[PDB]
Structures are given as C-alpha cells and as structure tokens.
C-alpha cells in the first residue's frame, strides 16, 4: 500500500497473507468463511508452495493471535489468462478451520444485484495489505489500508496500456500518490455499507504503483459471486 | 417504497417488489422482526470489525 495508513487493531480482520517457502508474504487474500480464502489466480504462480496466515498485523512481531493454515484445495478460475489477468480469481479451501477471534473474521459476500446498485455506486472502497509502500520500495511489515475511489470504466480503459475486461474495475487516483502495489495483489477490496464490509474486489494488477495517469486494477467480484458460491460448495 | 432512498430502510440487502421493499441479510445474520435490521447470530459475523474485545 502506497500512502494510506496502518490498519488499526480489529479493523482489517478479513485480511489473509499468503506466505511462501520461508514464511514471507507475497500476496494477500480475504477470509470468506472458516474454510475458504479468496485470492487472485495470478498469485498461484508466484510461489511453488504456500500457506495462509490470518490475524497478523505486524510481520516482525509474534503477537500471539496469528495462525497459519495449510491449503487443502486450490480452486482456480478455469478461464484465468496469464497475459491479460482476465478472470483473476481463486478460492482456497484450508486443511483446518479458522477460529474467528480478534483480528480474524470473514468479510461478507453481497447479493449481486444489490452490490451493483448500492456498493459499486459508492464513492470509495477500501484496499489493504502488506505490499510495497512505494513502487520500487519494500513490503510493509505492518498491515496498511487505503480508501480508493471507484473510477469510471471509460476513464479506466483510456488510461490503460492493457485491456480492461468486464471482469475488472479501476480504483484509486489519477495523480494523487496512493495505490495498492506489489505484495497487496490477491488481497481485499471491500466496500462499507452501514458499518458492514462487503467483498467487492480482489487486488489484481497495475502499471507500476501510484503512477500519474494510472489506476489500480481489481477483479470485479460481482461477476463472480455465483462462481464463488459454487467453489465453496 | 424504493431501495433508492435510504436503501429502503434495510440494514443490508434491499430488493423492490410491486409496491414494497423486501430487506434481507448475509449469512450469519437474521432479519429482525421489524423486517429491516440484520441481527448477528454469532460473535464474529461477516463484515464486522472486531472492536469489542471478548
Ligand atoms: C496483467 N498485466 C496486464 C500483464 C499487467 C501486469 C503488471 N504487473 C507487472 O508488470 C508487475 C506487477 C504487475 O501487476 C507489479 C504489481 C503492481 C501491482 C498493483 C498496483 C496497483 C494494484 Cl491495485 S496491484 O501489484 N503488483 N508491478 C510492480 C513491480 C512489477 C510490476
Ligand atoms: Ca505478527
Ligand atoms: Na494514478
């Protein structure tokens, strides 16, 4: 996360962290239930093997509330395309269930039509993660969040060197230096409605981070709500 | 009554019928007797920040 702020205690409890062969974070995820994590399909190719950490806010402190869970099943979208990141969505079933507690709770899946009329039409959503704090920088050891405006699709397409499919949406800022970045991808984009947070996106890609004239690109979760439900059985 | 004004007074999901709104809630909540509010069924309902230390 470039700009934004550190997540306060209890404020980002749906954040998950995918950790590679060395307990190092390389992607985010979103807790959906005791057994299921939402992430980006592209993250599956970034590490040969990985586990999922929940409850973490500071990767250099063993606070005590953190837990690591092994992955039992990977459910990748069968139309994920590496070249465009179209259909950039996966669900992970864990080997053992999450115990909800302080800093560990699921985000809500919205009904599709209501999400489109009521969530996607809000001014902003929130993105969070442990990713880089500037484009060429290092990952944050502390969990960060950032409010990101929804960006209209027409402006999104004009700004992009790469195709923006209807499985994607833009969020963030034209020139203001705030965005998600490398290491945040796969993590949550949620939208608040009367103090309840609903999954609206998955951090997917960008051209650099916080670049002038570029936006953050997110998987459009409304396109996949039925797919998620099926994947979770 | 319409979902476009104050979300039909629903706490969470709102849908329009012919001449009414119907509210509903995410899994882990029960729609209240008033037909508007969503009541968590457990202590870590989805979408809620964990702010009350149990
Ligand atoms: C999917 N495709 C159309 C081919 C574009 C891929 C761009 N790609 C790259 O070429 C990589 C990676 C990244 O997305 C990364 C990156 C950017 C971000 C985000 C910025 C805003 C986001 Cl929202 S996610 O997450 N990882 N960038 C920063 C360092 C390398 C470069
Ligand atoms: Ca920690
Ligand atoms: Na920008």
């Amino acid at each position: 996360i470039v700009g934004g702020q550190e997540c306060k205690d209890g404020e980002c409890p749906w954040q998950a962290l995918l950790i590679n062969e060395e307990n190092e974070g390389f992607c985010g995820g979103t807790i959906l239930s005791e057994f299921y994590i939402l992430t980006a399909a592209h993250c599956l190719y970034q590490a040969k093997r990985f586990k999922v950490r929940v409850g973490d806010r500071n990767t250099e402190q063993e606070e005590g509330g953190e837990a690591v869970h092994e992955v039992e099943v990977v459910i990748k979208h069968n139309r994920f395309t590496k070249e465009t990141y179209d259909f950039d969505i996966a669900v992970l079933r864990l080997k053992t269930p999450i115990t909800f507690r302080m800093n560990v709770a699921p985000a809500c899946l919205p009904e599709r039509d209501w999400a489109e009329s009521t969530l996607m039409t809000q001014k902003t959503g929130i993105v969070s993660g442990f990713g880089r704090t500037h484009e060429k920088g290092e990952q944050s050891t502390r969990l960060k969040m950032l409010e990101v405006p929804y960006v209209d699709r027409n402006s999104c397409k004009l700004s992009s060197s790469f195709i923006i499919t209807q499985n994607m949406f833009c969020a963030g800022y034209d020139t203001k230096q705030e965005d998600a970045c490398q290491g945040d991808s796969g993590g949550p984009h949620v939208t608040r409605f009367k103090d309840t947070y609903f999954v609206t996106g998955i951090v997917s890609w960008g051209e650099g981070c916080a670049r002038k004239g570029k936006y953050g690109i997110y998987t459009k979760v409304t396109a996949f709500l039925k797919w998620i439900d099926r994947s979770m059985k | 009554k319409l979902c476009s004004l104050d979300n039909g007074d629903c706490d969470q999901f709102c849908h329009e019928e012919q001449n009414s709104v119907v509210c509903s809630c995410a899994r882990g909540y029960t729609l209240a007797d008033n037909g508007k509010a969503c009541i968590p069924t457990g202590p870590y309902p989805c979408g809620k920040q964990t702010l009350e230390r149990r």
Side-chain angles (χ1 to χ4, degrees):
Chain A
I1 306 289
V2 185
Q5 56 198 337
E6 286 179 8
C7 287
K8 288 175 173 289
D9 225 356
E11 293 199 13
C12 291
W14 35 79
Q15 179 76 50
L17 184 63
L18 311 194
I19 55 173
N20 64 25
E21 310 176 63
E22 233 276 80
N23 297 308
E24 187 172 305
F26 65 94
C27 270
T30 304
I31 298 171
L32 297 185
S33 70
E34 70 179 7
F35 280 107
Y36 290 99
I37 307 292
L38 185 67
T39 193
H42 82 257
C43 286
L44 304 173
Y45 299 89
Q46 308 290 342
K48 312 303 175 56
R49 205 175 181 263
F50 63 89
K51 294 189 178 85
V52 177
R53 187 186 297 145
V54 301
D56 208 359
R57 293 176 61 249
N58 179 342
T59 61
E60 289 173 332
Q61 187 187 286
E62 306 289 349
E63 199 277 346
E66 308 90 342
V68 180
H69 289 265
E70 297 196 353
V71 179
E72 186 179 281
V73 190
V74 173
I75 307 143
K76 191 177 71 210
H77 201 291
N78 66 9
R79 300 196 59 185
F80 172 63
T81 311
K82 194 182 177 178
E83 285 72 33
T84 58
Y85 281 23
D86 197 17
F87 296 91
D88 192 11
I89 183 166
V91 164
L92 312 177
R93 189 186 166 88
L94 304 173
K95 282 188 203 301
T96 54
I98 297 163
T99 300
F100 305 144
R101 56 185 182 277
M102 180 58 69
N103 291 314
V104 186
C108 296
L109 294 158
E111 189 274 312
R112 179 182 191 159
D113 290 350
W114 182 82
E116 290 175 350
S117 68
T118 312
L119 300 178
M120 303 300 287
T121 57
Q122 300 292 302
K123 294 166 176 77
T124 70
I126 303 163
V127 58
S128 58
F130 292 93
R132 301 184 181 174
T133 60
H134 54 107
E135 183 177 320
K136 310 182 282 290
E138 297 285 294
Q139 295 227 196
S140 184
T141 60
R142 297 194 159 99
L143 178 55
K144 293 182 67 184
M145 57 170 266
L146 171 66
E147 197 163 7
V148 285
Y150 281 100
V151 168
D152 74 273
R153 182 170 175 82
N154 284 348
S155 305
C156 188
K157 291 170 63 185
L158 287 159
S159 79
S160 185
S161 307
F162 296 103
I163 187 168
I164 305 307
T165 76
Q166 283 275 9
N167 299 315
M168 295 173 199
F169 70 92
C170 269
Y173 293 99
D174 185 0
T175 59
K176 189 191 191 192
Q177 292 297 289
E178 295 195 303
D179 198 358
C181 198
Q182 165 78 235
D184 298 313
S185 72
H189 175 286
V190 296
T191 301
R192 189 183 167 186
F193 183 79
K194 296 195 174 63
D195 308 306
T196 304
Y197 295 79
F198 291 91
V199 183
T200 40
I202 301 166
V203 180
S204 185
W205 58 275
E207 295 180 58
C209 310
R211 293 198 192 151
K212 296 180 185 182
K214 302 288 177 182
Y215 299 106
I217 319 298
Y218 297 77
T219 307
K220 188 188 294 172
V221 168
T222 49
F224 301 108
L225 287 162
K226 283 173 185 171
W227 184 91
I228 294 166
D229 281 345
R230 196 194 331 113
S231 302
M232 292 174 68
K233 310 161 55 63
Chain B
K1 191 152 175 199
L2 300 165
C3 293
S4 56
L5 286 187
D6 311 313
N7 191 50
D9 301 314
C10 305
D11 268 7
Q12 294 185 10
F13 315 142
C14 183
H15 290 98
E16 289 164 13
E17 298 277 355
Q18 288 93 189
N19 289 32
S20 191
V21 300
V22 176
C23 309
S24 58
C25 314
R27 184 196 182 88
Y29 294 84
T30 303
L31 187 72
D33 299 337
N34 73 2
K36 303 295 190 190
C38 290
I39 312 302
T41 60
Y44 295 101
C46 70
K48 296 299 187 178
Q49 296 179 317
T50 61
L51 301 166
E52 194 265 316
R53 285 173 178 79
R54 278 161 54 78

PDB file of all heavy atoms in Angstrom, chain A residues 126-148:
ATOM      1  N   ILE A 126     -12.238   0.169   0.124  1.00  0.00           N
ATOM      2  CA  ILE A 126     -11.008   0.093   0.900  1.00  0.00           C
ATOM      3  C   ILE A 126     -10.205  -1.092   0.424  1.00  0.00           C
ATOM      4  O   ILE A 126     -10.739  -2.178   0.188  1.00  0.00           O
ATOM      5  CB  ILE A 126     -11.301  -0.037   2.382  1.00  0.00           C
ATOM      6  CG1 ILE A 126     -12.151   1.150   2.830  1.00  0.00           C
ATOM      7  CG2 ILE A 126     -10.013  -0.159   3.171  1.00  0.00           C
ATOM      8  CD1 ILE A 126     -12.820   0.923   4.149  1.00  0.00           C
ATOM      9  N   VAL A 127      -8.904  -0.868   0.293  1.00  0.00           N
ATOM     10  CA  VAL A 127      -7.964  -1.910  -0.076  1.00  0.00           C
ATOM     11  C   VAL A 127      -6.950  -2.026   1.053  1.00  0.00           C
ATOM     12  O   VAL A 127      -6.683  -1.046   1.765  1.00  0.00           O
ATOM     13  CB  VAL A 127      -7.259  -1.628  -1.439  1.00  0.00           C
ATOM     14  CG1 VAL A 127      -6.494  -0.307  -1.483  1.00  0.00           C
ATOM     15  CG2 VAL A 127      -6.421  -2.796  -1.870  1.00  0.00           C
ATOM     16  N   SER A 128      -6.426  -3.214   1.297  1.00  0.00           N
ATOM     17  CA  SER A 128      -5.486  -3.395   2.401  1.00  0.00           C
ATOM     18  C   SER A 128      -4.434  -4.419   2.025  1.00  0.00           C
ATOM     19  O   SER A 128      -4.605  -5.232   1.106  1.00  0.00           O
ATOM     20  CB  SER A 128      -6.237  -3.799   3.670  1.00  0.00           C
ATOM     21  OG  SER A 128      -6.968  -5.000   3.448  1.00  0.00           O
ATOM     22  N   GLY A 129      -3.319  -4.359   2.734  1.00  0.00           N
ATOM     23  CA  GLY A 129      -2.300  -5.363   2.563  1.00  0.00           C
ATOM     24  C   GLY A 129      -0.944  -4.987   3.131  1.00  0.00           C
ATOM     25  O   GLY A 129      -0.742  -3.918   3.724  1.00  0.00           O
ATOM     26  N   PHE A 130      -0.026  -5.912   2.910  1.00  0.00           N
ATOM     27  CA  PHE A 130       1.356  -5.807   3.408  1.00  0.00           C
ATOM     28  C   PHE A 130       2.319  -5.482   2.279  1.00  0.00           C
ATOM     29  O   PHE A 130       3.529  -5.679   2.434  1.00  0.00           O
ATOM     30  CB  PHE A 130       1.785  -7.142   4.054  1.00  0.00           C
ATOM     31  CG  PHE A 130       1.059  -7.481   5.326  1.00  0.00           C
ATOM     32  CD1 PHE A 130      -0.095  -8.263   5.296  1.00  0.00           C
ATOM     33  CD2 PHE A 130       1.580  -7.082   6.565  1.00  0.00           C
ATOM     34  CE1 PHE A 130      -0.764  -8.607   6.484  1.00  0.00           C
ATOM     35  CE2 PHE A 130       0.904  -7.426   7.767  1.00  0.00           C
ATOM     36  CZ  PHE A 130      -0.259  -8.188   7.703  1.00  0.00           C
ATOM     37  N   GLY A 131       1.838  -4.979   1.148  1.00  0.00           N
ATOM     38  CA  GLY A 131       2.666  -4.802  -0.029  1.00  0.00           C
ATOM     39  C   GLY A 131       3.576  -3.601   0.070  1.00  0.00           C
ATOM     40  O   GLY A 131       3.631  -2.901   1.096  1.00  0.00           O
ATOM     41  N   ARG A 132       4.269  -3.339  -1.033  1.00  0.00           N
ATOM     42  CA  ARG A 132       5.223  -2.228  -1.090  1.00  0.00           C
ATOM     43  C   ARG A 132       4.603  -0.865  -0.749  1.00  0.00           C
ATOM     44  O   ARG A 132       3.457  -0.575  -1.107  1.00  0.00           O
ATOM     45  CB  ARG A 132       5.833  -2.151  -2.489  1.00  0.00           C
ATOM     46  CG  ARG A 132       6.563  -3.402  -2.920  1.00  0.00           C
ATOM     47  CD  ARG A 132       7.222  -3.181  -4.280  1.00  0.00           C
ATOM     48  NE  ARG A 132       7.910  -4.386  -4.736  1.00  0.00           N
ATOM     49  CZ  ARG A 132       8.468  -4.523  -5.936  1.00  0.00           C
ATOM     50  NH1 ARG A 132       8.421  -3.530  -6.821  1.00  0.00           N
ATOM     51  NH2 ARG A 132       9.075  -5.665  -6.253  1.00  0.00           N
ATOM     52  N   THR A 133       5.395  -0.007  -0.119  1.00  0.00           N
ATOM     53  CA  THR A 133       4.937   1.318   0.339  1.00  0.00           C
ATOM     54  C   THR A 133       5.259   2.424  -0.665  1.00  0.00           C
ATOM     55  O   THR A 133       4.793   3.556  -0.541  1.00  0.00           O
ATOM     56  CB  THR A 133       5.510   1.661   1.705  1.00  0.00           C
ATOM     57  OG1 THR A 133       6.944   1.674   1.604  1.00  0.00           O
ATOM     58  CG2 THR A 133       5.049   0.629   2.744  1.00  0.00           C
ATOM     59  N   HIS A 134       6.029   2.054  -1.678  1.00  0.00           N
ATOM     60  CA  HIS A 134       6.203   2.830  -2.925  1.00  0.00           C
ATOM     61  C   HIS A 134       6.623   1.856  -4.035  1.00  0.00           C
ATOM     62  O   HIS A 134       7.053   0.725  -3.765  1.00  0.00           O
ATOM     63  CB  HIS A 134       7.165   4.041  -2.774  1.00  0.00           C
ATOM     64  CG  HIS A 134       8.515   3.703  -2.221  1.00  0.00           C
ATOM     65  ND1 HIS A 134       9.660   3.688  -2.993  1.00  0.00           N
ATOM     66  CD2 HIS A 134       8.910   3.424  -0.960  1.00  0.00           C
ATOM     67  CE1 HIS A 134      10.698   3.382  -2.232  1.00  0.00           C
ATOM     68  NE2 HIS A 134      10.271   3.222  -0.994  1.00  0.00           N
ATOM     69  N   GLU A 135       6.455   2.267  -5.283  1.00  0.00           N
ATOM     70  CA  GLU A 135       6.640   1.360  -6.399  1.00  0.00           C
ATOM     71  C   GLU A 135       7.920   0.504  -6.334  1.00  0.00           C
ATOM     72  O   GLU A 135       7.845  -0.718  -6.475  1.00  0.00           O
ATOM     73  CB  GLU A 135       6.547   2.105  -7.730  1.00  0.00           C
ATOM     74  CG  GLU A 135       6.662   1.174  -8.923  1.00  0.00           C
ATOM     75  CD  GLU A 135       6.495   1.863 -10.251  1.00  0.00           C
ATOM     76  OE1 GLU A 135       5.625   2.748 -10.391  1.00  0.00           O
ATOM     77  OE2 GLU A 135       7.230   1.485 -11.178  1.00  0.00           O
ATOM     78  N   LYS A 136       9.072   1.133  -6.101  1.00  0.00           N
ATOM     79  CA  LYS A 136      10.353   0.410  -6.102  1.00  0.00           C
ATOM     80  C   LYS A 136      10.819   0.116  -4.677  1.00  0.00           C
ATOM     81  O   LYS A 136      11.982  -0.238  -4.455  1.00  0.00           O
ATOM     82  CB  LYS A 136      11.438   1.183  -6.885  1.00  0.00           C
ATOM     83  CG  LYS A 136      11.000   1.640  -8.263  1.00  0.00           C
ATOM     84  CD  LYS A 136      12.129   2.358  -9.022  1.00  0.00           C
ATOM     85  CE  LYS A 136      12.325   3.799  -8.563  1.00  0.00           C
ATOM     86  NZ  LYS A 136      11.197   4.685  -8.967  1.00  0.00           N
ATOM     87  N   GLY A 137       9.905   0.226  -3.711  1.00  0.00           N
ATOM     88  CA  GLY A 137      10.224   0.053  -2.304  1.00  0.00           C
ATOM     89  C   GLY A 137      10.089  -1.371  -1.805  1.00  0.00           C
ATOM     90  O   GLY A 137       9.965  -2.324  -2.581  1.00  0.00           O
ATOM     91  N   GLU A 138      10.161  -1.503  -0.492  1.00  0.00           N
ATOM     92  CA  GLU A 138       9.990  -2.789   0.158  1.00  0.00           C
ATOM     93  C   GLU A 138       8.570  -2.943   0.674  1.00  0.00           C
ATOM     94  O   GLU A 138       7.831  -1.954   0.874  1.00  0.00           O
ATOM     95  CB  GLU A 138      10.992  -2.964   1.302  1.00  0.00           C
ATOM     96  CG  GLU A 138      12.464  -2.981   0.879  1.00  0.00           C
ATOM     97  CD  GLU A 138      12.867  -4.283   0.223  1.00  0.00           C
ATOM     98  OE1 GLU A 138      12.870  -5.322   0.915  1.00  0.00           O
ATOM     99  OE2 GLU A 138      13.185  -4.266  -0.985  1.00  0.00           O
ATOM    100  N   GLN A 139       8.219  -4.194   0.922  1.00  0.00           N
ATOM    101  CA  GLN A 139       6.962  -4.515   1.566  1.00  0.00           C
ATOM    102  C   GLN A 139       6.875  -3.921   2.965  1.00  0.00           C
ATOM    103  O   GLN A 139       7.890  -3.781   3.662  1.00  0.00           O
ATOM    104  CB  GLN A 139       6.778  -6.031   1.617  1.00  0.00           C
ATOM    105  CG  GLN A 139       6.640  -6.702   0.245  1.00  0.00           C
ATOM    106  CD  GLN A 139       5.480  -7.691   0.168  1.00  0.00           C
ATOM    107  OE1 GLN A 139       5.420  -8.507  -0.733  1.00  0.00           O
ATOM    108  NE2 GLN A 139       4.547  -7.602   1.106  1.00  0.00           N
ATOM    109  N   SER A 140       5.661  -3.568   3.370  1.00  0.00           N
ATOM    110  CA  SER A 140       5.403  -3.067   4.705  1.00  0.00           C
ATOM    111  C   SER A 140       5.431  -4.232   5.688  1.00  0.00           C
ATOM    112  O   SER A 140       4.869  -5.295   5.414  1.00  0.00           O
ATOM    113  CB  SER A 140       4.030  -2.406   4.748  1.00  0.00           C
ATOM    114  OG  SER A 140       3.779  -1.835   6.010  1.00  0.00           O
ATOM    115  N   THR A 141       6.070  -4.043   6.834  1.00  0.00           N
ATOM    116  CA  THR A 141       5.970  -5.056   7.875  1.00  0.00           C
ATOM    117  C   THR A 141       4.658  -4.909   8.642  1.00  0.00           C
ATOM    118  O   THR A 141       4.295  -5.756   9.440  1.00  0.00           O
ATOM    119  CB  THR A 141       7.154  -4.989   8.853  1.00  0.00           C
ATOM    120  OG1 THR A 141       7.172  -3.703   9.461  1.00  0.00           O
ATOM    121  CG2 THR A 141       8.466  -5.267   8.131  1.00  0.00           C
ATOM    122  N   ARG A 142       3.959  -3.805   8.419  1.00  0.00           N
ATOM    123  CA  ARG A 142       2.698  -3.567   9.108  1.00  0.00           C
ATOM    124  C   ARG A 142       1.528  -3.531   8.118  1.00  0.00           C
ATOM    125  O   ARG A 142       1.653  -3.016   6.996  1.00  0.00           O
ATOM    126  CB  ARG A 142       2.783  -2.284   9.942  1.00  0.00           C
ATOM    127  CG  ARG A 142       3.856  -2.367  11.071  1.00  0.00           C
ATOM    128  CD  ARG A 142       3.672  -1.236  12.074  1.00  0.00           C
ATOM    129  NE  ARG A 142       4.285  -1.533  13.371  1.00  0.00           N
ATOM    130  CZ  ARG A 142       5.472  -1.089  13.776  1.00  0.00           C
ATOM    131  NH1 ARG A 142       6.209  -0.301  12.995  1.00  0.00           N
ATOM    132  NH2 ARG A 142       5.920  -1.430  14.977  1.00  0.00           N
ATOM    133  N   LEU A 143       0.398  -4.079   8.540  1.00  0.00           N
ATOM    134  CA  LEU A 143      -0.766  -4.093   7.665  1.00  0.00           C
ATOM    135  C   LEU A 143      -1.274  -2.669   7.468  1.00  0.00           C
ATOM    136  O   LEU A 143      -1.500  -1.921   8.443  1.00  0.00           O
ATOM    137  CB  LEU A 143      -1.834  -4.975   8.286  1.00  0.00           C
ATOM    138  CG  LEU A 143      -3.169  -5.093   7.541  1.00  0.00           C
ATOM    139  CD1 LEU A 143      -3.012  -5.547   6.095  1.00  0.00           C
ATOM    140  CD2 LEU A 143      -4.056  -6.059   8.336  1.00  0.00           C
ATOM    141  N   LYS A 144      -1.470  -2.306   6.195  1.00  0.00           N
ATOM    142  CA  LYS A 144      -1.957  -0.975   5.823  1.00  0.00           C
ATOM    143  C   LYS A 144      -3.324  -1.057   5.134  1.00  0.00           C
ATOM    144  O   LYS A 144      -3.682  -2.091   4.572  1.00  0.00           O
ATOM    145  CB  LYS A 144      -0.961  -0.277   4.914  1.00  0.00           C
ATOM    146  CG  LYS A 144       0.365   0.077   5.632  1.00  0.00           C
ATOM    147  CD  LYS A 144       1.331   0.820   4.714  1.00  0.00           C
ATOM    148  CE  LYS A 144       0.808   2.190   4.361  1.00  0.00           C
ATOM    149  NZ  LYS A 144       1.723   2.908   3.372  1.00  0.00           N
ATOM    150  N   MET A 145      -4.067   0.034   5.179  1.00  0.00           N
ATOM    151  CA  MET A 145      -5.298   0.154   4.416  1.00  0.00           C
ATOM    152  C   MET A 145      -5.323   1.492   3.711  1.00  0.00           C
ATOM    153  O   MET A 145      -4.547   2.411   3.994  1.00  0.00           O
ATOM    154  CB  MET A 145      -6.538  -0.068   5.297  1.00  0.00           C
ATOM    155  CG  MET A 145      -6.638   0.852   6.488  1.00  0.00           C
ATOM    156  SD  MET A 145      -8.222   0.758   7.333  1.00  0.00           S
ATOM    157  CE  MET A 145      -9.061   2.108   6.524  1.00  0.00           C
ATOM    158  N   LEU A 146      -6.218   1.599   2.758  1.00  0.00           N
ATOM    159  CA  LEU A 146      -6.309   2.782   1.933  1.00  0.00           C
ATOM    160  C   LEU A 146      -7.697   2.905   1.342  1.00  0.00           C
ATOM    161  O   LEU A 146      -8.221   1.925   0.759  1.00  0.00           O
ATOM    162  CB  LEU A 146      -5.288   2.673   0.794  1.00  0.00           C
ATOM    163  CG  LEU A 146      -5.413   3.743  -0.286  1.00  0.00           C
ATOM    164  CD1 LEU A 146      -5.080   5.134   0.241  1.00  0.00           C
ATOM    165  CD2 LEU A 146      -4.535   3.388  -1.476  1.00  0.00           C
ATOM    166  N   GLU A 147      -8.320   4.070   1.471  1.00  0.00           N
ATOM    167  CA  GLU A 147      -9.561   4.347   0.792  1.00  0.00           C
ATOM    168  C   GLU A 147      -9.283   4.691  -0.671  1.00  0.00           C
ATOM    169  O   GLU A 147      -8.474   5.573  -0.964  1.00  0.00           O
ATOM    170  CB  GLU A 147     -10.269   5.509   1.490  1.00  0.00           C
ATOM    171  CG  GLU A 147     -11.755   5.612   1.131  1.00  0.00           C
ATOM    172  CD  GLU A 147     -12.574   6.475   2.093  1.00  0.00           C
ATOM    173  OE1 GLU A 147     -11.988   7.119   2.986  1.00  0.00           O
ATOM    174  OE2 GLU A 147     -13.822   6.497   1.948  1.00  0.00           O
ATOM    175  N   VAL A 148      -9.936   3.993  -1.599  1.00  0.00           N
ATOM    176  CA  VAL A 148      -9.721   4.218  -3.023  1.00  0.00           C
ATOM    177  C   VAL A 148     -11.029   4.526  -3.731  1.00  0.00           C
ATOM    178  O   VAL A 148     -12.006   3.771  -3.623  1.00  0.00           O
ATOM    179  CB  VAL A 148      -9.019   3.032  -3.713  1.00  0.00           C
ATOM    180  CG1 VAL A 148      -7.530   2.988  -3.359  1.00  0.00           C
ATOM    181  CG2 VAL A 148      -9.644   1.678  -3.353  1.00  0.00           C
TER     182      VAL A 148
END
